[PDB]
Amino acid sequence: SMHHTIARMNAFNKAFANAKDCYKKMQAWHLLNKPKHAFFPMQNTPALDNGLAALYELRGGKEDAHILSILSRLYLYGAWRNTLGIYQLDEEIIKDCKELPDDTPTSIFLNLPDWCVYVDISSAQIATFDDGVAKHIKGFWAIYDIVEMNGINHDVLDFVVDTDTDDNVYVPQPFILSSGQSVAEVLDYGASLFDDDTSNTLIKGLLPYLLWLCVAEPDITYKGLPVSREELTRPKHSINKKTGAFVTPSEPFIYQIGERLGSEVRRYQSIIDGEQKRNRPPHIRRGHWHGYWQGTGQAKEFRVRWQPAVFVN
């Protein structure tokens, strides 16, 4: 009855007793530096705890992945606990999600509602593979970041895979948006300053599910009722005017995406089945992400939208 992400975050906060302190510091940095897209840069995470910096600046800091685990989860939870958004994608939509068109602008992934969203795609039956160890992907966090490749600050989108395991690898995977380049350019042809490739292919795979939160006209429902993108970007966290402290949600806001569409598809399949149950002497054309460019006003833009499933009878 309590989501696994919340349970694991609550566990972390308990086991690393300095967690609440670090979030407050992050909050302080946020309010002062007023970042436009991110909430708190990953780079700055050594500052939050002094013991972590002391153990991270020994030879063995970038070698110890447990410290990087701590820092990654501080960076992630600190941004995520202010909104606690969980977006469950519908079956009949997850299936039709395949890789996006390769010239989609990165810029459209600057349109997330919150600083960090958790996307639930366990109905995709996608797994993650590492050295003989295969793990089912329950979901993933998309969280913003501001990074410094020296002298320059870029807008990066980080992905954190959730496999619901004790040894989950929470180390964020970056995907630079600040460039004018499309998804293909960055991810595919290695133009990014991040060239790890395994991470880049993993990100590309994640992209088609994350797109729903960046569309101008989302099928988001909260508890069965439509959410306008206007209402979705409304603030959740409350800031105290005298103290400066943050008031955060006690429970997550679990949304559903593509549920009208899913129901429609379920009903189409129901007609097919009914026809086959009465045997008298009728198919679904699957939906898909569709990309195109209006290319008007001289400014070149690439538009992607969901082309829905269609009952062909």
């Binding site: 990953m42 780079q43 970038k62 992945a65 990087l68 995709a124 039956q125 996608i126 797994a127 993650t128 593979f129 590492d130 050295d131 160890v133 295969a134 793990k135 089912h136 992907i137 990074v147 410094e148 490749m149 020296n150 992905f159 895979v161 690898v169 180390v171 964020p172 995977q173 970056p174 300053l193 991040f194 060239d195 790890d196 395994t198 991470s199 292919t201 993993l202 795979g205 994640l206």
Partner: peptide
């Protein structure tokens, strides 16, 4: 258990890129 995962993605690295 035969109804299962059919897609594999490369597991994320446990390091952060230089920077």
């Amino acid at each position: 258990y035969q109804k299962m995962i059919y897609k594999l993605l490369p597991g994320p690295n446990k390091m952060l890129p230089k920077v």
